[PDB]
Design an enzyme around this catalytic site. Structure first.
Site, mmCIF file in Angstrom:
data_model
loop_
_atom_site.group_PDB
_atom_site.id
_atom_site.type_symbol
_atom_site.label_atom_id
_atom_site.label_comp_id
_atom_site.label_asym_id
_atom_site.label_seq_id
_atom_site.Cartn_x
_atom_site.Cartn_y
_atom_site.Cartn_z
ATOM 1 N N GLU A 1 0.969 -1.177 0.003
ATOM 2 C CA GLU A 1 -0.032 -0.071 0.189
ATOM 3 C C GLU A 1 0.398 1.030 0.025
ATOM 4 O OE1 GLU A 1 -2.852 1.508 -0.659
ATOM 5 O OE2 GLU A 1 -4.233 0.993 0.873
ATOM 6 N N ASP B 1 -2.132 -4.841 0.505
ATOM 7 C CA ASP B 1 -1.110 -3.547 2.096
ATOM 8 C C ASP B 1 -0.001 -3.944 2.519
ATOM 9 O OD1 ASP B 1 -3.721 -2.243 1.658
ATOM 10 O OD2 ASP B 1 -4.985 -3.084 2.855
HETATM 11 MG MG LIG Z 1 -4.745 -0.952 -0.608
#
Ligand SMILES: [Mg+2]
Length: 175
Positions: free
Chosen positions: A58, A86
Site C-alpha cells: 500500500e 496492503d
Molecule cells: Mg490497498
C-alpha cells in the site's frame, strides 16, 4: 465546524498525506472536494505503517506495487493476489488486506472477503471503536502492538471531534 482538508494536513504525517493525495488523484478524485475520503485514505495508510518482517504494498505507485507483488509471488510459491494487498508477511508467508472502518467490522470484513475471493490472503479489520476482526482469529500482531493502532484511531477520532469533523466523517463511509 472546521475544515477536514485543514485537519488532515496538520494531523497526519506529510508523507502519509503526500501518498494519499496521489492515491486520490490517480482516480480523478480531488482531495480538496472529497476531504472525508482523503482523511480515510491517510488513516488507512497510517495503520498499514504501524502494522508493518513485513513488506509494504500500500502507498506504492501501482507499477511498483505489482512489481513488488509479482517478484514475491515467484521467490515464494504464493499465488498472485488479484487486487493489490496492503502487506506481505513472510513470517506467516501470506499477503494481508488491511481495513479501517467506520461501520460494523463484520460487514466490512465480508465485503473485503467477497471482493478479493481470497484463498490465502489474510484479512484484518480495525475500527474506530476498538472492535477488530482477523481471518481465523489469527491476529498476527501481539496484544500491545494492536493496542497502539486502536489508540491512534481513537486519537484521530477525538481530534476530529474537537473540530466538529467526526459526525460527517463517521457516517460517510460507502461500500
Ligand atoms: Mg490497498
Amino acid at each position: 465546524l472546521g475544515s477536514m482538508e485543514d485537519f488532515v494536513r496538520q494531523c497526519f504525517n506529510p508523507m502519509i498525506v503526500e501518498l494519499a493525495e496521489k492515491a486520490m488523484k490517480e482516480y480523478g478524485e480531488d482531495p480538496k472536494i472529497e476531504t472525508n475520503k482523503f482523511a480515510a485514505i491517510c488513516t488507512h495508510l497510517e495503520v498499514c505503517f504501524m502494522y508493518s518482517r513485513f513488506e509494504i504494498i500500500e502507498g506504492r505507485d501501482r507499477t511498483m506495487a505489482w512489481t513488488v507483488v509479482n517478484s514475491i509471488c515467484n521467490t515464494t510459491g504464493v499465488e498472485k493476489p488479484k487486487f493489490l494487498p496492503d502487506l506481505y508477511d513472510y513470517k506467516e508467508n501470506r499477503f494481508i488486506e488491511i481495513g479501517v472502518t467506520r461501520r460494523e467490522v463484520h460487514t466490512y470484513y465480508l465485503e473485503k472477503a467477497n471482493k478479493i475471493k481470497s484463498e490465502k490472503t489474510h484479512i484484518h479489520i480495525f475500527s474506530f471503536t476498538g472492535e477488530e476482526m482477523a481471518t481465523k482469529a489469527d491476529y498476527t500482531l501481539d496484544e500491545e502492538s494492536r493496542a497502539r493502532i486502536k489508540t491512534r484511531l481513537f486519537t484521530i477520532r477525538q481530534e476530529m471531534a474537537s473540530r466538529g469533523l467526526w459526525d460527517s466523517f463517521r457516517q460517510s463511509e460507502r461500500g
